[PDB]
């Protein structure tokens, strides 16, 4: 079974520091060419760089030349990027690519992709606020966290129907926020209760706002 | 050098229709055209190969031709799976090339937005911010207009829109407006209004409150 695992992604300041690694298993490893591919939140596909069978060549970006670089250990099966001077710009999901082919690096097996954040901001859980209320609107606010991503869930998963959960978007400070909605009979208000479960993993923080009517 | 153009942004079409997609480059990629699909929380997934080679695993209503600088992808006949977001690659040269992706969308009857208006918490004002959450929920179009008014005057560049992918069940967009101020500022003020313009409306639709 095909495999490309990855990790060593995370929060990391500019100017810092991180080596990707990609461990690959269900394939002849050196039998093939690799590439990583990264893509910031909201964006689409940006080639970052590629490099042969063996150790010889490689071939960067002009986003990344002289701050990344790309290798394999073809007898670990692994594949690393060494990423150095990093910038906000650089915070995307980095995938480990594989090439379909001996003679091109287009990618047919993606790693299942790991987040970099690039930035100054320190690990803040959420604050969360409630968005109080036949169809009435009620939700939370889930505002000023740091990093990607939240979860959010409604009475611990048990109402899905009718919720929306909003992209989160970066503010001026550096945190993040959005918020989750959903739509509810007017006539349940006062009766069905609406928790939404707020779990920021990075910050071990867990949040449940009981959501009420003015 | 080495540009792709994909064409159209946006192809909103209804399950069982034809999908054609474009992708121009710049520069003649002896035939080393890649197309890929990417559906929210997932990795793209490689459709067509270099020679408009059709993967092991997809299905035939997928089929990629073109030649020189001009490729096209066709989707034969559109199933509920296959509205997803579509990049073409060129792999005959580095610095290798994406194109900017076409997202091919369900088209569905209008619908007008519901709009509902959030003042601030009495938890959040507590904190020292304030911020209003207007919410447009369920439409379609995509395309919508927001514009805050604070006791009538006209807010900018204080405002952050988010807006949801397409409703599975639904097919329809809901959006999110966030006016932030102070909580000095907001309470220095009286009337905070939110002003929606959309294709299902007559006329813009304006939720507002006081105290």
């Known amino acids: 079974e095909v495999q490309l695992v990855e990790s060593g992604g995370g929060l990391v300041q500019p100017g810092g520091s991180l080596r990707l690694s990609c461990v690959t298993s269900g394939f002849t490893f050196r039998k093939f060419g690799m590439s990583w591919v990264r893509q910031a939140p909201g964006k689409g596909l940006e080639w970052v760089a590629s490099?042969?069978?063996?150790?010889?060549?490689?071939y960067y970006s002009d986003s990344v030349k002289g701050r990344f670089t790309i290798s394999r250990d073809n007898s670990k099966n692994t594949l690393y990027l060494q990423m150095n001077s990093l910038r906000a710009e650089d915070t995307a999901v980095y995938y480990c690519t594989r090439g379909y082919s001996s003679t091109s690096y287009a990618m047919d097996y993606w790693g299942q992709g790991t987040l970099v954040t690039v930035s100054s901001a320190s690990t803040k859980g959420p604050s969360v606020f409630p968005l109080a209320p036949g169809t009435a609107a009620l939700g939370c606010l889930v505002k000023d966290y740091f990093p990607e991503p939240v979860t959010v869930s409604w009475n611990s998963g048990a109402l899905t129907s009718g919720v929306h959960t909003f992209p989160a978007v970066l503010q001026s400070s550096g945190l993040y926020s959005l918020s989750s909605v959903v739509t509810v009979p007017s006539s349940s208000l006062g009766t069905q209760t609406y928790i939404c479960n707020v779990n920021h993993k990075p910050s071990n923080t867990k949040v449940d706002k009981k959501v009420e009517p003015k | 050098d080495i540009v792709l153009t994909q064409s159209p942004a946006t192809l909103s079409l209804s399950p069982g229709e034809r999908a054609t997609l474009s992708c121009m480059t710049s520069?003649?990629?002896?035939?080393?055209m890649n197309w890929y699909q990417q559906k929210p929380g997932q990795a793209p997934r490689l459709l067509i190969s270099?020679?408009?080679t059709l993967r092991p695993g997809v299905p035939a209503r997928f089929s990629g031709s073109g030649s020189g600088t001009d490729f096209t992808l066709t989707i034969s006949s559109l199933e509920p799976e296959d509205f997803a977001v579509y990049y073409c690659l060129q792999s005959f040269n580095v610095p290798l090339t994406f194109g900017q992706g076409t997202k091919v969308e369900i088209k569905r009857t209008v619908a007008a937005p519901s709009v509902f208006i959030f003042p601030p918490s009495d938890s959040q004002l507590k904190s020292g911010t304030a911020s209003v959450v207007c919410l447009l929920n369920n439409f379609y179009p995509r395309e919508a207009k927001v514009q805050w008014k604070v006791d009538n005057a006209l807010q900018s560049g204080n405002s952050q829109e988010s807006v949801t992918e397409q409703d599975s069940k639904d097919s329809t967009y809901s959006l999110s407006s966030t006016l932030t101020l102070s909580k000095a500022d907001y309470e220095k003020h009286k009337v905070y209004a939110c002003e929606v313009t959309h294709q299902g409306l007559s006329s813009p639709v304006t939720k507002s409150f006081n105290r």
């Open positions: 490099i042969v069978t063996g150790g010889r060549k490689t």
């Open positions: 270099e020679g408009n």
């Open positions: 520069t003649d990629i002896d035939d080393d």
